[PDB]
Amino acid sequence: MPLVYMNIIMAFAIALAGLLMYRSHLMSSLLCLEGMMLSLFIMSTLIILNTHFTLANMMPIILLVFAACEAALGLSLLVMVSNTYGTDYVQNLNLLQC
Amino acid sequence: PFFDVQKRLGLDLDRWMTIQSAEQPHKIPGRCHAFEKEWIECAHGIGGIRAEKECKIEFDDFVECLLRQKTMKRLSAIKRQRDKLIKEGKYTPPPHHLGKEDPRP
Amino acid sequence: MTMMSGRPGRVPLQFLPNEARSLPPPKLTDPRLVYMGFLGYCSGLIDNAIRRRPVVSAGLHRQLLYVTSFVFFGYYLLKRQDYMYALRDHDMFAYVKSHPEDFPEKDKKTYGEILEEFHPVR
Amino acid sequence: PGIVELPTLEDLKVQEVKVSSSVLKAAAHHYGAQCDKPNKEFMLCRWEEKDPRRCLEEGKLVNQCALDFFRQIKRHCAEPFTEYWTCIDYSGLQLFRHCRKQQAKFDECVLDKLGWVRPDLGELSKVTKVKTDRPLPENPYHSRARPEPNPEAEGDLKPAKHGSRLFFWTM
Amino acid sequence: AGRIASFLKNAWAKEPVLVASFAIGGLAIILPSLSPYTNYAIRINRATPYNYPVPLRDDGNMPDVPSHPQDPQGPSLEWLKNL
Amino acid sequence: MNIMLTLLTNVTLASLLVLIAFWLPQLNAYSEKTSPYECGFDPMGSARLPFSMKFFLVAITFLLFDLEIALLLPLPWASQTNNLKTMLTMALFLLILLAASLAYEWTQKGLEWAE
Amino acid sequence: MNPIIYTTLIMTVMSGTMLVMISSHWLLIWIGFEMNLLAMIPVLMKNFNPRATEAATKYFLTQATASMMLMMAIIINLLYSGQWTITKMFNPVAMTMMTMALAMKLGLSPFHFWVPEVTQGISLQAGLLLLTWQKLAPLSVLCQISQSINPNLMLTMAMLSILIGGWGGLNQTQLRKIMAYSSIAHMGWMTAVLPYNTTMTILNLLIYITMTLAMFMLLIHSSATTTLSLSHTWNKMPVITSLMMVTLLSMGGLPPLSGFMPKWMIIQEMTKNESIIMPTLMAMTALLNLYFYMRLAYSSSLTMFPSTNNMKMKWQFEHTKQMKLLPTMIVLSTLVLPMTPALSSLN
Amino acid sequence: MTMYIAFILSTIFVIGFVGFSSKPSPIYGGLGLIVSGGVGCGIVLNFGGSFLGLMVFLIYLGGMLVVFGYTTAMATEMYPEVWVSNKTVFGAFVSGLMMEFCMVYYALKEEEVEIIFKFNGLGDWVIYDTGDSGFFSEEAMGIAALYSYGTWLVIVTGWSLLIGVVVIMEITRGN
Amino acid sequence: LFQAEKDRRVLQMLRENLEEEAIIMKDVPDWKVGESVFHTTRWVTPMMGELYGLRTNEEILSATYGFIWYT
Ligand SMILES: CCCCCCCCCCCCCCCCCC(=O)OC[C@H](COP(=O)([O-])OCC(O)COP(=O)([O-])OC[C@@H](COC(=O)CCCCCCCCCCCCCCCCC)OC(=O)CCCCCCCCCCCCCCCCC)OC(=O)CCCCCCCCCCCCCCCCC
Ligand SMILES: CCCCCCCCCCCCCCCCC[C@@H](O)O[C@H](CO[C@H](O)CCCCCCCCCCCCCCC)COP(=O)(O)OCC[N+](C)(C)C
Ligand SMILES: CCCCCCCCCCCCCCCCC[C@@H](O)O[C@H](CO[C@H](O)CCCCCCCCCCCCCCC)COP(=O)(O)OCC[N+](C)(C)C
Ligand SMILES: CCCCCCCCCCCCCCCCC[C@@H](O)O[C@H](CO[C@H](O)CCCCCCCCCCCCCCC)COP(=O)(O)OCC[N+](C)(C)C
Ligand SMILES: CCCCCCCC/C=C\CCCCCCCC(=O)O[C@H](COC(=O)CCCCCCC/C=C/CCCCCCCC)COP(=O)(O)OCCN
């Protein structure tokens, strides 16, 4: 595994860690999710191109689709909670406990 | 769990994309078509447990083709020994390894 | 781990292979079938109880359908269970026959030659 | 796990065909029409052996046949051929469609100088047969012996002895 | 018979763009199944030699396969030149 | 290589123009001159307050409709395949489904802005 | 929500689950997971209030993160072996990430935090769907890769799930949180035996599903979501409370009821692999679940709580909507133990 | 080793990921994600996948636009945070940069294994093919095979998109 | 013709690399010169690290990125 594969894996790990830590905004976490999606796309594309897996070339494109379907979902949710609180702070999501 | 509707009906919903040696468009071959074909032929019909131990040679060759780790190690050793021989100066690499070669078609 | 899902020659979604026709079918007076009919009768009684109806005599057609459906499902369930157990025994005996070195027939001593330690209770 | 057999540099020596891409493209059709036989043996050897080290002589014969083809073209009429391939070389994509008059002149020269006929559209893509004395390889993949499969399921089916044998159940 | 006619007139009077778009979409859906040139398009796509044609080994009983490209045997592209 | 040189040249020329703009003239900056502009009077609030978007649902739909162009872009290469019937059927199916998505968004009053 | 839209969303969820369980390609399984989550999100938000919206947001975040690590594990397995088929995961790191992602998808501890919140925030029908149907796809995926699962990590998570569910269910007065903690404990029980025998996993899942269906359908019949609200049911329909107490007894694992059958079948299996400490700890920990079932049984059926005057009016009206499958679910959740050997039909 | 192009691009990709992963005001996070998308697109073209990189870049530029549009509405934060405007953001950014530099140095000078395996450098040019054939683009042919081989994929993806439109409209309904 | 010339060129580059490796690794403890890496004995396409590993940088850049960078 050359430096490129390790750098892409590190990018995915950084995006996942940034998602797992919440500061205030939900939009920043959605941005981290988009970053994870981009890192996965890049790694899959590199792996498929390196081995000349011809059919698998359609795999990353499909990977993109369910990307924004996940994004369009989150943004949608981000609207509604805002309509309840006037802000997208994840602090306000504390009505339900363990 | 796994309800094999594809095998029951012969539908082939996603079995065309599972391996790289299976009917690529314009007959374009994978980088490791021979290795994967050999390993699949070795491991066919003997179960996972038996294939993990008896087809280990073909799988090792396939992984070597896929990642080329041992080849990179060999090349790194070659270039390190070449650098050590050049630093003290008793190698003098040949002219065709420096750009003074008479190329062929 | 799964033991019989990868058995060679297995049809994916058959639920009753043709070889299962070689085994005797369960008798209609099987105690398990009677228990399934009892389960259907209890289901009918509970259905009558929930809807605030006379429990024992509200719907005779409904109770009869309950019992009949339970018995009908139980017949094929018992057939499949018996077939699976027969398959297990068949595979076990075949493996034992095919690997004599792993199941050695050992000559067995009589109790007169074995020395068991005696532990008095006092 | 073994040393790799590589031919010596003397076995790789051959008289190279030193014409440029445009020159080859201009005479490509007549070359495929005239030098088809050694080319087809070489291609069949290459695809059957899957090893460049087992078909070097066929490549040498291909080079020799190409040399004879170009030597005949040079000997009989080379001026129309030069006028055609300079035109082919001018185009950035080396388009046949830009120079049909030079192609016509070259075709008419080769038709009466050597009896050569330019192949029609679709003929050069045909799948042809090869008569060869080279034995068909038996194990081109160098495959090992395949493992013996699990034996079989044989015999008739009998009911389980004493039923399920699960704890206290007698059925 | 008459309800569809009045509906279409009202749609053309109010929303010509939707009528034109639906007509174009319906034509694009229906026409290819009723055209004789789809087979010609398929054959033209099939006749393009993207990769090398690997020659066959003569076992002595292949009359249909040619021995040289200019032999009359094999597929012919005569229909393409006259189309 | 060539494209990298082109991008470098363009960015360098733009940055040089910025440098000439910010280093050639004589600048006299004071507090009143650098204040925000709201047509002569001081702004009431901050320009970093929330700004309601009445077309948010169309913005969400634009993401999926942008994915559909990514799906439909390889059509020129797809039209070269042998299975023209299946290729045409699948392309028409995808376009029909996207048209149905647009129709469902239209009829459910989804293309109309909030008030 | 429009009934046609609700039906097509439900069918899209079930189609995603079906695609997960019928696919031999990892990409198709991932696509099925994405479809299931996408169609599942609006079902949780069927009734609009701040609490339902919050639950959907937490569920979306959790499932999205689990999907991301699922996809990265797939990509790593592809990198170290050019295989797309679902198989024994030639790379251990990819196997670990897949185990973690499926653990969060199921809700195994310590990824259990979202389950009580999501269950409490949504309605009873959405809770039933979440606690019954959403468990099929991850467990179906796990049953295929069990030969490569590291026993230590899976068993640690199963023990943690059992302990955490038993401890959490003790402090709850809301019924949906109790159901969520019971689901966590039962998830631990399912996943404890998975590396050894997947047939026991399937049997445990089926029994848990039937008991959860009976429980949730009884809770829907008597519109109670708290302990005190359920304490009023004895004065309106005693039979519902009696069947509820029998079902709670079955869930606790007391013989000869059905809930004893899976545990009994799991422990035995674990004793064939020289595993004695783990089954003993699991059996001892199930007593906490039994205790917080018994507290509910005491509150609702074995004692009569004070009632209210207006309840008299409710005596004049009947349950208009009938659930056909409820008696069958109750019977299958209580009286099934004598038919234990039928589990041989599951392999 | 040669021209450092792939290595520099991957490093900038990681830097942009750290930049938007420190979670400043979402404007700068979107900027960092845009630059990361462009850099990854260039990385992909450096391996022969021009269409995938352009497509990824093209998809991302517009997704971010929608994200900027939503940030200006619901995540405004009257004092927006930049990487140097807050101690937590700067700490996370510096930690990510320092960790990336240490990993690069450890895997470059020596052969260190972090999680999966080790790396010795040599440049990514070593693992290429030398395959010399083709009058078409292999990546383009593979992507175009979606409409002949991937009928199931097209069906499921189109259904997912239609369901997504229905789902977002149901979610944003409110009431 | 192109196939034949490519085969000869690849074999020549491999043989030149082998004849050099016989010289750099004369005095390494246990190096087998020309030893293969795969267990199988069939032909394996070179990796472009085995053909240009001991050559100047500009040939490496050509053989790696010439087609991609040619515009
Ligand atoms: C190992 C072997 C064992 C296997 C075990 C397998 C698993 C075991 C069971 C798993 C757990 C079951 C959990 C199910 C709970 C369902 C959740 C729910 O809906 O609410 C709960 C529900 C709600 O109660 P509620 O409060 O009274 O309802 C209020 C209303 O819902 C208030 O809402 P509303 O006002 O809007 O009312 C609308 C209402 C009324 O609905 C209507 O209005 C009807 C109008 C129709 C509209 C037409 C639209 C269609 C056009 C769209 C086309 C989309 C195509 C999608 C496909 C895309 C493909 C890519 O619709 C509904 O209520 C729900 C509709 C349900 C339809 C289900 C259709 C099945 C989908 C199957 C898909 C799979 C296909 C293959 C995929 C291939 C792969 C790609 O409560 C119950 O239903 C009682 C529980 C009963 C559950 C079933 C019990 C267990 C199952 C036993 C059956 C046999 C199983 C074994 C079969 C093996 C093969 C023979
Ligand atoms: C509370 C008890 C559980 C309740 C169960 C639900 C009750 C209704 C029964 C469900 C009806 C459907 C069953 C038959 C329809 C078709 C069956 C066929 O299509 O599927 C077969 C499979 O059929 C099932 O295996 C049998 C289902 C029967 C369920 C009953 C067993 C319950 C365990 C013992 C409890 C006693 C129950 C008594 C009932 C009163 C194919 O086998 P296969 O595709 O290769 O297996 C896939 C999984 N593998 C490969 C991983 C193994
Ligand atoms: C068209 C696109 C391509 C253009 C190609 C030409 C590139 C143009 C050059 C880039 C911008 C130049 C702007 C032209 C005006 C000069 C601005 C600057 O260079 O002068 C001063 C820079 O000098 C500083 O005052 C400090 C000078 C000394 C301190 C460090 C310099 C050390 C260098 C050694 C010099 C000694 C002799 C060297 C001989 C080679 C800044 O003074 P300041 O008032 O703020 O800014 C306003 C300038 N005003 C006055 C004209 C309005
Ligand atoms: C049996 C179950 C029936 C009821 C359940 C329905 C739920 C499933 C959804 C629809 C099922 C149909 C999918 C069938 C699999 C498609 C693949 C197979 O059928 O062949 C394809 C045939 O596909 C054809 O285009 C016709 C079928 C496509 C139907 C159009 C889509 C309709 C789907 C509607 C339901 C989906 C959800 C709702 C969306 C609106 C192409 O094969 P072919 O090209 O020969 O050879 C390929 C191999 N090559 C490349 C080497 C040559
Ligand atoms: C078989 C082919 C189908 C597939 C191809 C379709 C191609 C894509 C075209 C459709 C894209 C999406 C269409 C969205 C539908 C819009 C629904 C709608 O709400 O339209 C109404 C209008 O109502 C309508 O639906 C339009 C009229 C009916 C539809 C158009 C005509 C239907 C088809 C007619 C052509 C048939 C074929 C040609 C026959 C030629 C004559 C013999 C809009 O009005 P408002 O915006 O609310 O106005 C507010 C301000 N006053």
Side-chain angles (χ1 to χ4, degrees), chain B residues 1-5 8, chain C residues 2 4-6 10-16 35-36 39 70 73-74 76-77 80-81 84, chain G residues 140 143-144 198-199 202-203 205-211 258 261 328-329 331-347:
Chain B
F2 197 32
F3 297 116
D4 231 344
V5 193
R8 181 74 196 266
Chain C
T2 165
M4 320 222 60
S5 300
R10 176 162 174 159
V11 172
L13 296 152
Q14 204 161 42
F15 178 86
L16 255 174
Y35 192 61
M36 293 277 294
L39 290 183
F70 265 75
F73 169 66
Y76 305 89
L77 182 72
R80 173 157 170 81
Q81 162 203 325
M84 293 285 338
Chain G
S140 89
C143 286
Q144 276 167 292
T198 53
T199 302
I202 298 158
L203 167 74
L205 170 82
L206 289 181
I207 299 265
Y208 158 79
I209 278 167
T210 205
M211 304 192 279
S258 286
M261 184 204 297
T328 302
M329 299 294 102
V331 163
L332 289 189
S333 80
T334 54
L335 313 164
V336 166
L337 193 71
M339 305 280 297
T340 304
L343 61 100
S344 77
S345 70
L346 287 168
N347 52 38

Side-chain angles (χ1 to χ4, degrees), chain F residues 73-81, chain H residues 51 137 140-141 143-145 147:
Chain F
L73 271 181
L75 278 164
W77 302 296
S79 313
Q80 317 283 345
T81 192
Chain H
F51 186 93
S137 190
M141 282 333 98
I143 295 203
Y147 294 113

Side-chain angles (χ1 to χ4, degrees), chain G residues 299-315:
Chain G
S299 317
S300 57
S301 168
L302 295 177
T303 51
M304 329 201 285
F305 271 43
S307 175
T308 49
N309 188 65
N310 288 346
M311 171 88 24
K312 287 185 185 54
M313 168 157 339
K314 299 195 192 189
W315 295 344

Side-chain angles (χ1 to χ4, degrees), chain F residues 51 53, chain H residues 64-74:
Chain F
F51 193 82
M53 191 189 344
Chain H
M64 291 300 71
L65 165 95
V66 174
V67 157
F68 168 91
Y70 270 62
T71 298
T72 39
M74 279 157 261

Side-chain angles (χ1 to χ4, degrees), chain F residues 37-95:
Chain F
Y37 165 82
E38 191 148 281
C39 296
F41 284 108
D42 280 321
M44 149 60 156
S46 173
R48 303 269 143 111
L49 279 166
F51 193 82
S52 301
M53 191 189 344
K54 311 297 181 200
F55 52 95
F56 62 94
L57 183 74
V58 189
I60 304 173
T61 310
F62 167 72
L63 298 172
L64 319 174
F65 280 25
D66 207 13
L67 293 177
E68 275 251 29
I69 87 161
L71 254 47
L72 295 169
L73 271 181
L75 278 164
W77 302 296
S79 313
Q80 317 283 345
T81 192
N82 276 203
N83 327 323
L84 266 182
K85 281 182 64 261
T86 295
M87 178 265 131
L88 185 60
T89 302
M90 293 331 291
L92 293 172
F93 162 84
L94 225 41
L95 280 151

Side-chain angles (χ1 to χ4, degrees), chain H residues 23-39:
Chain H
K23 277 178 302 297
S25 177
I27 308 286
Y28 303 95
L31 152 74
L33 193 35
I34 277 150
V35 86
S36 295
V39 150

